[PDB]
């Protein structure tokens, strides 16, 4: 009557975990761009109809592999060049007396120290210019470095660049990527419009805190997402629908000096400044920022009520990474004070300037044991960026009034890549099946 | 004759020793000579499985001389059956059909397709 | 060439799993007598204890995911019956060919 018939190539898939390789678009870089496979210019996207898939952005395994691949790509370029072991010694530091303004009174320091030359039984007394955030006094004065008692000092390697390169996380044979096409998707729940693909889109590994850089934009409205909106210990991600341009600049003119230390090695430091000493600053538009804050407070009242006063405040306290917006453009690391943007109270042509500070000692990925010393960049550094997101947390009051306090936060690098991989899901295809038919062999 | 011994002969004399070339396309630390052997083995697996996957979608898996029901078009070659197998070789025939290779490769895929079970299943 | 800095251990293993997933599927399809077929028919009968549904309900209303979820408790015995029936048909063909 009925006989079993096998079928090869049925659309049955399950959930599994695998490894995703890199694929970039066809001078060296930190991230290995030239080591990836070339990208197919005609990507194949299969719109799988009548399939409702349930997505959950807070239980994804792609971000945990992406963070490991980003961390492993950073500790391989600092190896094969010069490490600064005997650098932190007793420094004799004075202040600077030049054509200087009032705000730079205690920032720049002129330090001098002894150092071993190529001969082991000789010394050489040299001098350099250091910042205020890189020296610590020992109670002309006596100063030392900050990481000489905590980590090991190695120099940032002067042949690589720190610009972001968009990469694609493709899938090997036997796997696929489901992607939801909902423009108002909040990363958790069902989706009736799915697409099967092999690779992802262009993702730029940009690191920042309290202000999401270039990234990607939304489609229709400003999206609000959080793991748990009731608990005040989870970060809230806000995705804008329009980009806001910010122009950062540093008017200093630094020169690089090469103190040849040890045998066959060198040490790049700051020389003498030719000109004046001006503060590095970032200008942002005042007209568009109020409209984006109005869109945020309009899209934020759906979870807190229609009669809730929203008061924006600055950061509370902590270290230098969380309290200040840190980024890197041009080659130097900037820490900006964003206490002037989050100042508003919403009830039911000018530009805002933010001063920043240049840091040369950076403890990346909040680790203890490994440090980095960035070389000085010669010239004027001016960059532009698009703020296409925000990371905001809140604090718990007494739950009697109708007010709320939202503060910018961060520190954890997993939230910077969860706003781009909130729709891709890796699945494993199984092509074998059986079915009853009326056919017989031979 | 040996491996690649009939390269100078015609197409009629080199199509009889395919079993010679049909058996030579397949065959511990991390030093500079340890990774090259693994790379060569992986490349030898890749250059055999890719060539064997093309014969599986055409219905000629396990056959050296396999012919199908694809009609030969008159616009690909205007020669007879005596000026090809007795005069031209395999190194000169590949240069003439280089602009019509993908058309035959696409027509060979649907053939082994229009020959699949239909309703007979009910 | 072959460099294993960060992206050499992820490109070789992908080809390794691709080769393994191709070879395991070809070995599972070769032992059933359907080397190079998709809608090939078998000789084992369909038992009424696995699925009592009719032929007009499965091919026009059901889905492959629901069909995989429905008879998931009777999956390995069909493969065992196919592995027995292929060897039995091969032995019967060898007995018929010996005369």
């Amino acid at each position, epitope marked *: 009557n009925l006989w079993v018939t096998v079928y090869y190539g049925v659309p049955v898939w399950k959930d599994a975990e695998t490894t995703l390789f890199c694929a970039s678009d066809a001078k060296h870089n930190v991230w290995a761009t030239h080591a990836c496979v070339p990208t197919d*210019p005609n990507p194949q996207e299969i719109h*799988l109809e009548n399939v409702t898939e349930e997505f959950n952005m807070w239980k994804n395994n792609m971000v945990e592999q992406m963070h490991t691949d980003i961390i492993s790509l950073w500790d391989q370029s600092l190896k094969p060049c010069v490490k600064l072991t005997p650098l932190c010694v007793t420094l004799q530091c004075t202040n600077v007396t030049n054509n200087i303004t009032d705000d730079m009174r205690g920032e720049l320091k002129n330090c001098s120290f002894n150092m071993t030359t190529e001969l082991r039984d000789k010394k050489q007394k040299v001098y350099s210019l250091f910042y205020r955030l890189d020296v610590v006094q020992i109670n002309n004065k006596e100063y030392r470095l900050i990481n000489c008692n905590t980590s090991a000092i190695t120099q940032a390697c002067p042949k690589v660049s720190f610009e972001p390169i968009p990469i694609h996380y493709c899938a090997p044979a036997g796997f696929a990527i489901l992607k939801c096409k909902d423009k108002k998707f909040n990363g958790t729940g069902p989706c009736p419009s799915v697409s099967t693909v092999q690779c992802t889109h262009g993702i730029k590994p940009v690191v920042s805190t309290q202000l999401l850089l270039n990234g990607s934009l939304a489609e229709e409205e400003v999206m609000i997402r959080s793991e748990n909106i009731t608990n005040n210990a989870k970060n809230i991600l806000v995705q804008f629908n329009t980009p806001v341009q910010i122009n950062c600049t540093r008017p200093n003119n630094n020169t690089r000096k090469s103190i040849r230390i040890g045998p066959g090695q060198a040490f790049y430091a700051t020389g003498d400044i030719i000109g004046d000493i001006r503060q590095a600053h970032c200008n942002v538009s005042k007209a568009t920022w109020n409209e984006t804050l109005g869109k945020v407070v309009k899209q934020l009242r759906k979870h807190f009520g229609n009669n809730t006063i929203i008061r924006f405040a600055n950061s509370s306290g902590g270290d230098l990474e969380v309290t200040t917006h840190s980024f890197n453009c041009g080659g130097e690391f900037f820490y900006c004070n964003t206490s002037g943007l989050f100042n508003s109270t919403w009830i039911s042509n000018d530009s805002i300037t933010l001063p920043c500070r240049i840091k040369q000692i950076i403890n990346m990925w909040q680790r203890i044991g490994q440090a980095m010393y960035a070389p000085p960049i010669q010239g004027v550094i001016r960059c532009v960026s698009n703020i296409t997101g925000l990371i905001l947390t809140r604090d718990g009051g007494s739950t009697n009034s109708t007010t709320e306090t939202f503060r910018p936060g961060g520190g954890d690098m997993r939230d910077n890549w969860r706003s781009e991989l909130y729709k891709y899901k890796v699945v494993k295809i199984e092509p074998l099946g059986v079915a009853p038919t009326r056919c017989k062999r031979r | 004759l040996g491996f690649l011994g009939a390269a100078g002969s015609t197409m009629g004399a080199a199509s009889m020793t395919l079993t010679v070339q049909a058996r030579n396309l397949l065959s511990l630390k991390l030093t500079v000579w340890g990774i090259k052997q693994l790379q060569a083995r992986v490349l030898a697996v890749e250059r055999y499985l890719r060539d064997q996957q093309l014969l599986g979608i055409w219905g000629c898996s396990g056959k050296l001389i396999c012919c199908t029901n694809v009609p030969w078009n008159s616009s690909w070659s205007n020669r007879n059956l005596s000026e090809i197998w007795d005069n031209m070789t395999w190194l000169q025939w590949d240069k003439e059909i280089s602009n019509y290779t993908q058309i035959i490769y696409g027509l060979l895929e649907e053939s082994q397709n229009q020959q*699949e079970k239909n*309703e007979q299943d009910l | 060439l072959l460099k294993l800095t960060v992206w050499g251990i992820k490109q070789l293993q992908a080809r390794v799993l691709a080769v393994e997933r191709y070879l395991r599927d070809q070995q599972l399809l070769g032992i059933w007598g359907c080397s190079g077929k998709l809608i090939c028919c078998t000789n084992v009968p369909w038992n009424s204890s696995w699925s009592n549904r009719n032929l007009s309900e499965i091919w026009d209303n059901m889905t492959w*995911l629901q069909w995989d979820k429905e008879i998931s408790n009777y999956t390995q015995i069909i493969y065992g019956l196919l592995e027995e029936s292929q060897n039995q048909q091969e032995k019967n063909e060898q007995d018929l060919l010996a005369l």
Partner: antibody
Amino acid sequence: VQLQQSGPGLVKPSETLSLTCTVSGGSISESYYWKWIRQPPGKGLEWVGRIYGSGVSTSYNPSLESRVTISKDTSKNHFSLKLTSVTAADTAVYYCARSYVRAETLMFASLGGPYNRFDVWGAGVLVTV
Amino acid sequence: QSALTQPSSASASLGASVTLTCTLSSGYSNSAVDWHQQRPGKGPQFVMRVGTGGIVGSKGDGIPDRFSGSGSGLNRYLIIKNIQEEDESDYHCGADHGTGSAFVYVFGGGTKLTVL
């Protein structure tokens, strides 16, 4: 999700051609195929060109090769059609249409696979030469 | 290929079932044929996509349940059960062949359904 056509008036022979079809409600860089179809008055339809929206792969008719040029501009989501050496007997109606890949699951008796499906048609403009 | 279809002469009365037929060239016997409905004076729209057996996908936006599809070997039938006052137009076939680089789309001659 909608298509708006804009066509010129009369076309002189031995000249160039320029047509446009603006989309509305969707991006131009998505995974969708845009097709330019021609139809003479009285006879049947005739497909001319196809262009992928997320790539550079274009397809033209084999009877009108080295004559049809389809370009795309992602500034205001346009795709343009050009046909040089205009024959005076080529007065027709032009249509812009969309087609996408569908591989839905319904457990058919045959396997099949992914196919092409038309979803949005066009109004069509009249070209008199 | 080439979409060998019936001519544009088809008689039909108010309350009869019409079975329009689209044929192949007896070389492929396994394809999918689209059905385009072009109204006189208006633009054409997509209605159905028939093949081996019933419909392979879904119907168009704004199509009643009286239209049905069937397939037999080389013939593809579009069956209309009831005829209203808006059920006359030009019915065209369509067949796609090839790959992403060698794509071809063959249309048909198109029939013309009349009413009495």
